[PDB]
Amino acid sequence: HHHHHMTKLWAVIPAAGSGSRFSKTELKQYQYIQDATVIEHTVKRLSQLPLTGYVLAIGKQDTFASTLSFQDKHKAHFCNGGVERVHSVLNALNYLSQIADEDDWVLVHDAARPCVTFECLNTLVKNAIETNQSAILAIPVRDTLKQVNQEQQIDKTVSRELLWQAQTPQIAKIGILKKAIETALKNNLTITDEASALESIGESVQVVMGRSDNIKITYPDDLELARLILQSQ
Amino acid sequence: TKLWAVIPAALKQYQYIQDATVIEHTVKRLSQLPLTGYVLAIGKQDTFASTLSFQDKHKAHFCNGGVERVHSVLNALNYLSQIADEDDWVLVHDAARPCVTFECLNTLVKNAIETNQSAILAIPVRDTLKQVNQEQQIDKTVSRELLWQAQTPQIAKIGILKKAIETALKNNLTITDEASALESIGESVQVVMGRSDNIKITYPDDLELARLILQSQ
Fold first, then answer.
1. What residues pair up with B141 in beta bridges, in sequence order?
2. Which family does the entry's similarity section mention (chain B) (predicted)?
């Protein structure tokens, strides 16, 4: 039986790569916004949900994350990440499988998205739990899409009809998502987000409207903009 | 060679970001270029655009907009054709993109002049794309390979872009942006790196985000 009244929520924050403290480029999730790292902000935001626990899948050489003063640290778990994000997610799901029920829900969320709103989190969770189906935050594509060649010239316009930009969190039941990722990897599929793995095994995934301000800190000015967004929230 | 701007404006553009409307912010940002003039294509019943204090008013022009954005642009190009040379450059820019940076504008203009060819600001697609049905269920993931999100300005010579739009419309070709009209007549269009924060204000909450972007810059 997979449809239950009693529900538990878990969060997973996946990293990619070794996370060595001696790399020349700083990881965006460990840059500071005021007095805490981006990932501390992200954990604090997700912790506004009724989480039973959260799992950070961190690089094998990352000795930094476990030392941080996370919100609700008593709910914090740490496991080994993988080469790619999907591998880190699978590791965390294998970890969760031994401390949680397969029919518990897990929210997989980008470490570098600290500005996702509590309202959006609530709607996503509410939607998934009620429909008993997986869901993601996403927003419609608003820009005209162009296919561009190696010489930076436009080849042609590409239709944007019915296209959405996926955001995170992406929420699904632990056992279902773990099986989706295992199967997709075993079929040598290219997996980008959890939804793409669920889609590969015929699981329905519902889109819940995200926000433009649910930015993934990537570019140089994104740190400051995220600071301003968090301050406005 | 002179530089002109066209803003199809026929509404989020009359929404406020602090003490000015979105379109005023956009005009002020574009006005940092050495423009000879800029043209706002407005609705025939629009008396509001006349109650705005636009940066560099002496260079402001107003013409009738059209049904669709491409018609507003074509109208503005026909207007510009009577005050400018056909080989002058025109930047067509969304009224609802007030956060485009001066650096990006300068790079776009420079690229166009050096290559002697049309160009647009654009950024690579970084998010995973989903095809979504009317019931908000995902159908499938769509490859983002070689895909860029077109932004504005989109820059071309007045005569060439006018002809392109004119050719596409007499031939019933689907047109979206200026790049798509130039595509219809085989003109090459180069992409110039834009910015993720060159947002096109679409939803009410985008006004707040645009406010913060302008401040974050």
1. B130
2. Belongs to the IspD/TarI cytidylyltransferase family. IspD subfamily.
Q: Which of B129, B139, B188 sits opposite A165 (nearest CB)?
A: B129
Chain B residues touching A218 at Cβ < 8 A: 126, 196
Query: Residue B140: its chain A contacts at CB < 8 A?
Result: 199
Count of CB contacts below 8 A, A vs B? 142
Residue A138: both structure tokens together: 């996403």
> CB–CB of B140/A138 below 8 Å?
no
Is B34 within 8 Å of B110 (Cβ atoms)?
A: no
Asked if residue A82 is part of any domain, the answer here is yes
CA pseudo-torsion sign B214, A232, A37, B127: negative
- List Cβ<8 Å contacts ≥24 apart for A2-9: A2/A103, A2/A173, A3/A132, A4/A103, A7/A104, A7/A105, A7/A129, A8/A52, A8/A100, A8/A101, A8/A104, A8/A105, A9/A49, A9/A50, A9/A51, A9/A52, A9/A104, A9/A105, A9/A106, A9/A107, A9/A125
- Considering only the beta carbons, identify the residue of B128, B179, B191 that sits closest to A152: B191
3-state secondary structure (DSSP) of residue A175: helix
**Residue A140, preceding bond cis, omega within 30 degrees?**
no
CATH number at residue A70: 3.90.550.10
Name the structure determination technique: X-ray
Quote the domain boundaries for residue B122.
3-216
Alpha carbon distance B181, B121 (integer Å): 16
Q: Which residues of A50-81 are buried (b: 16+ CB within 10 A; e: fewer)?
A: ebbbbbbbbbeebebbeeeebbeeebbbebeb
CB contact at 8 A, B191 and B122: yes
Spatial separation of the C-alpha atoms in residues A82 and A93, rounded to whole Å: 12
Place of tokens 């067509």: B92
Look at residue A4 and tell me if it is in a domain: no
**Total domain count for chain A?**
1
Residue of A nearest to B184 (CA): A156
Per the CB < 8 A criterion, the answer to whether A3 and A43 are in contact is no
What is the end-to-end Cα distance of chain B in Å, rounded? 30
